[PDB]
A paper describes a structure:
In each map, the capsid was well ordered, while the densities for the Fabs above the 2-fold axis could not be interpreted for model building. As for the 3-fold antibodies, only a single Fab bound to the 2-fold region, in two potential binding modes, resulting in distorted densities during icosahedral averaging. For the sixteen 2-fold binding Fabs, this strategy resulted in maps reconstructed to 2.54–3.56 Å resolution. The localized reconstructions with C2 symmetry relaxation confirmed that only a single Fab is bound at the 2-fold region. In all maps, the VH and VL chains are well-ordered, enabling the building of atomic models. The epitopes for the sixteen 2-fold Fabs comprise VR-III to -VII, and -IX of the AAV9 capsid. On the aa level, all 2-fold-Fabs contact D532 and Y706. Other frequently contacted residues are T491, T492, R533, D556, N562, N704, and Y705, which are clustered around the 2-fold symmetry axis. Furthermore, for all the 2-fold Fab-complexes, movements occurred in VR-IX near the 2-fold axis. While, for AAV9 capsids in absence of Fabs the residues 704–707 adopt the same conformation in both symmetry-related VR-IX loops surrounding the 2-fold axis, there are numerous variations of side-chain orientations in the different Fab complex structures.
The AAV vectors are composed of non-enveloped T = 1 icosahedral capsids, consisting of 60 viral proteins (VP), and package single-stranded DNA transgene cassettes. A major challenge for the utilization of AAV vectors in the clinic is the presence of pre-existing neutralizing antibodies (NAbs) in a large percentage of the human population. The presence of pre-existing neutralizing antibodies in large portions of the human population poses a significant challenge for AAV-mediated gene therapy, primarily targeting the capsid leading to vector inactivation and loss of treatment efficacy. This study structurally characterizes the interactions of 21 human-derived neutralizing antibodies from three patients treated with the AAV9 vector, Zolgensma®, utilizing high-resolution cryo-electron microscopy. The antibodies bound to the 2-fold depression or the 3-fold protrusions do not conform to the icosahedral symmetry of the capsid, thus requiring localized reconstructions. These complex structures provide unprecedented details of the mAbs binding interfaces, with many antibodies inducing structural perturbations of the capsid upon binding.
Author numbering:
A (entry chain H): 20 to 147
B (entry chain C), E (entry chain F): 287 to 308, 357 to 373, 423 to 442, 444 to 511, 513 to 619, 687 to 736
C (entry chain L): 23 to 127
D (entry chain A), G (entry chain D): 252 to 282, 351 to 353, 357 to 360, 376 to 400, 483 to 487, 496 to 521, 596 to 600, 623 to 628, ...
F (entry chain E), H (entry chain B): 440 to 481, 575 to 600
Write the structure that this text describes.
């Protein structure tokens, strides 16, 4: 089934912080890479960050670079995105995307970031 | 002279999970699959060379402070016990093995430099001719967690079934990573350490330099390069008292088009991934 | 980065008719590309990945082809269920992964 | 010792925060198993203060390089070291340089806590 | 009288990976962990009972058509060879084991019914007292692909360390699944099959009914319920020729705050998940 | 002495809309009927479930008249 | 047979008509290994037309219930069947009902295709 | 006769911005300097890499004057 559920705030004051949590089930969380895709209202989806199955390597968008931090917990089977110092431009619908194919232990991992399964999405809106 | 001649995948699995141990690498060997007509330590250390100590007990002394504080004429010598609180400074009997640095490359391209460094930026040795150092001394492929990086010439790169001869992409060819050997061995892309380059004095600061390559010194222990089912060739049962279960090679149970290590619809036997043998563990 | 450009803004065609829409990208994306669809108020769904390789849960009517800077998705025998926005994405040169503007339908 | 308990100890139990000193292991009630020039405790593989799946828990109940006063601090900065898996370690005891088992060299179900 | 008294997890791993074989379940057993003071077939068939046939060879006849087409007075009898094209109708010498159905429960609560059916919807046997059927006959826990469904009373449910006595959450307990035996045994939540309930005639349509419970018949085969490290009690080596590598039971590779099957910082030993015995495969 | 097995004590939190939950409890001398029993006997023999429950459908049971 | 090739055969190679008839297996050149009242071939565990992890590849080079004319089609509708892992299989040959190893009962590196 | 091992032939496709790529080829009779060998000798001895490359930093090497 590979169901993806994430929970996050719907409002914050600009310059503030929030913590998104995506909880996974139906597949081996450790095996596959994960990442967040953000969609603005009435706009195309834009990629935010990326994190490997191990969690050793993480990538970020230039817009977001250094401002947000992505985190994985394999044991607790959840994916995190900690965003802070938000701006009005950040308001959008965040998604949890499961990377397809899985990371392999023996080979030096090469990553093709095309997402097989997605989340229902949460809405973050920052305005006063 | 390749293990996949003499071993099936099932036997190779059977071998590597239960046991602690048991020529230019040209093509032309007996093919891995019997129906095709054609024309050593095996464990991972559970301890790291630098953590061998008892964490609960103090030791010997090290030099903690060379000045009293900020100002003039503050020179001093102070000392402290090496202990659990600071484990970096304790004296140790053995030291990690030899190192010859390889340039570091990242599989994701946007990280790599925009220049042709394939040949120029590589580790080579001379004999009036220069030859590439491949695979070289046995060293850890990358620091813990960083799989996307591989030493430029320090790893055995196999290739996927049906791969072309020239200029194939990264996904096309398999790159083995020696993650297990990091415990005793330095990372192939990191320097071995630092040395002192001078003598300090009232007018001279302590100055250091990086060790790019280090030969054998008395006390070096190391592990050698693992052997792979696809790898060239030229039983000890497991004695461990470990309580919690081992990491064992296994095949994931998930629906897929093809069975791994089996023929496809057209009858081509394929080996999906390299398989080395280090899975069970031993204390260092 | 690489800028994906998906040429028709809104392609309005009748059902039971073969639809071909495309998206061009700067430099070369080799064979690494993927097609998505987003129905209103619904998460995306992966359609095609690589060049022609069709994902498992996809109807056999969807098919696609292309290479390099240019790519084509071919929907045959359109149905009422297939009306939505489409997207292409190249995983070749990343970060940052880029997504096309989209083609409504 | 430990009131008859095997207890996970780690870098965070000490408070840690420095990479080179980050450790993971166990402390045993006691006085194959894991010589260091010093209760019995032992360290295993870690990453930071956490433990990789290759860690091992043992229940005992179940049986030249040149070496370096100036008015500055050179105790750590000026010393010769070697680094292993990213962690630096002092070289102790030990052209600036020249050259272990390994390959080369009523009833209740709760356990009783009252002793 | 619980396997984890006599086996360590490392030992239980050696057993289940390498071997095809080897009083009311009250509390109070010896502890799993030795420092605490206190007050069989093991394989999964690689084939299903209904696929045992040779896929390349036709068999025998079955009744393909009872009519020629649409209209009046179209009755006919047509026969076809049961063969690779249609594998449902072929004749078989054996049938799956017996079944006594359980109500199906979903671990995603929103798709369960909004009513209290814990007891009222349960399979039971009376002896003038109605006792719940737990776990009951051996049956596959869920159909292929559905991991979110479990039979109401049809499984063994172990609590995690620290889990309270009464009304704990679903996460706090460990629900075992029998999925391995789906080859020879009917699914616990599915009807056994269909039987004709009447005699057809020109005036009577063929009627059927569902078989909700089934007793032993000649020709049935079945597997017993697997035993777990945590489960009640009261060697045979693998000879198999299987080419592709096995499924094995391995501890997770990823870093964690605390090691599985070990003690934490407080000194509390815990068993993370229930461990069954069936990993290796045999032919049916 | 309690068994170490659990049973499904409750399916709902209370009366209302969308009350679904899954609660588990230890079987013990207090609730003898729901304990695990290794052997079953050889008035109707008991009950079986006749359908899959859902949000749309309530659980149903049938009487077993004969058994093998 | 098969030009001396072991080959994968599946539901998709036969047309993939239905879940009841889904299968996965291999066809061998031949004429511990897998009596059904019929070249050597065999089937293994399959999910739809695909193959699960448990499925194994074999290289041979390595050695009462009631049974039922109305003018309607009742061949398959009115048939007595049994269900296994969500597939209805006809009961063949065999109060509407009453009461196998198991617990109960120049040099070129490519292979040569020319013969 | 070729080896079954591969080496890294090209790190860029051409001249211009963002041409990073990873290409691999078979080590064989044509280019013999890049073949992997089991034994090494024991003018400078060779070259080692002195730095990590990155988008900013070019790969640097240095001469081994003495080696153990």
């Amino acid at each position: 089934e590979v169901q993806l559920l994430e929970s996050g705030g719907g409002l914050v004051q600009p310059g503030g912080s929030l913590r998104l949590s995506c909880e996974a089930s139906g597949f081996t969380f450790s095996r596959y890479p994960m990442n967040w895709v953000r969609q603005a209202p009435g706009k195309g989806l834009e990629w935010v960050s990326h994190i490997s199955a191990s969690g050793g390597t993480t990538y970020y968008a230039d817009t977001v670079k250094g401002r947000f931090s992505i985190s994985r917990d394999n044991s607790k089977n959840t994916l995190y995105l900690e965003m802070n110092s938000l701006r009005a431009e950040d308001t959008a619908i965040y998604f949890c995307a499961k990377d397809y194919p899985p990371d392999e232990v023996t080979m030096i991992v090469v990553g093709m970031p095309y997402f097989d399964s997605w989340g229902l999405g949460t809405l973050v809106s920052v305005s006063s | 002279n390749r293990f996949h001649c003499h071993f099936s995948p099932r036997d190779w699995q059977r071998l590597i999970n239960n046991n602690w141990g048991f020529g230019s690498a040209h093509e032309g060997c007996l093919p891995p699959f019997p129906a095709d007509v054609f024309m050593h330590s095996s464990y991972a250390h559970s301890q790291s060379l630098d953590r061998l100590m008892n964490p609960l007990i103090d030791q010997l002394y090290y030099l903690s402070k060379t000045i009293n504080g900020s100002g003039q004429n503050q020179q001093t010598l102070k000392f402290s016990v090496a202990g659990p609180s600071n484990m970096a400074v304790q004296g140790r009997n053995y030291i990690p093995g030899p190192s010859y640095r390889q340039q570091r490359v990242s599989t994701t391209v946007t990280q790599n430099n925009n220049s042709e460094f394939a040949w120029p930026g590589a580790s080579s040795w001379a004999l009036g001719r220069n030859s590439l150092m491949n695979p070289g001394p046995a060293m850890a492929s990358h620091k813990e967690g960083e799989d996307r990086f591989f030493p430029l010439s320090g790893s055995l790169i196999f290739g996927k079934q049906g791969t072309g001869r020239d200029n194939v992409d990264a996904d096309k060819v398999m790159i083995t990573n020696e993650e297990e050997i990091k415990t005793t061995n330095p990372v192939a892309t990191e320097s071995y350490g630092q040395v002192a380059t001078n003598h300090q004095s009232a007018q001279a600061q302590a100055q250091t330099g990086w060790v790019q390559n280090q030969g054998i010194l008395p006390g070096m222990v190391w592990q050698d390069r693992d052997v792979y089912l696809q790898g060239p060739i030229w039983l000890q049962k497991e004695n461990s008292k470990r309580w919690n279960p081992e990491i064992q090679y296994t095949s994931n149970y998930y629906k897929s088009n093809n069975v791994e290590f089996a023929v496809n619809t057209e009858g081509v036997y394929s080996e999906p991934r390299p398989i080395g043998t280090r899975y069970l563990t031993r204390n260092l | 980065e690489i800028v994906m450009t998906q040429s028709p803004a809104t392609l309005s065609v009748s059902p039971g008719d073969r639809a071909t829409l495309s998206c061009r990208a700067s430099q070369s994306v080799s064979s690494k590309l993927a097609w998505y669809q987003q129905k209103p108020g619904q998460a995306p769904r992966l359609l095609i990945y690589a060049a022609s390789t069709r994902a498992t849960g996809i109807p056999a009517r969807f098919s696609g082809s292309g290479s390099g800077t240019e790519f084509t998705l071919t929907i045959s025998s359109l149905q009422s269920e297939d009306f939505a926005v489409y997207y292409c994405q190249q995983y070749n040169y990343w970060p940052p992964i880029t997504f096309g503007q989209g083609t409504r339908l």
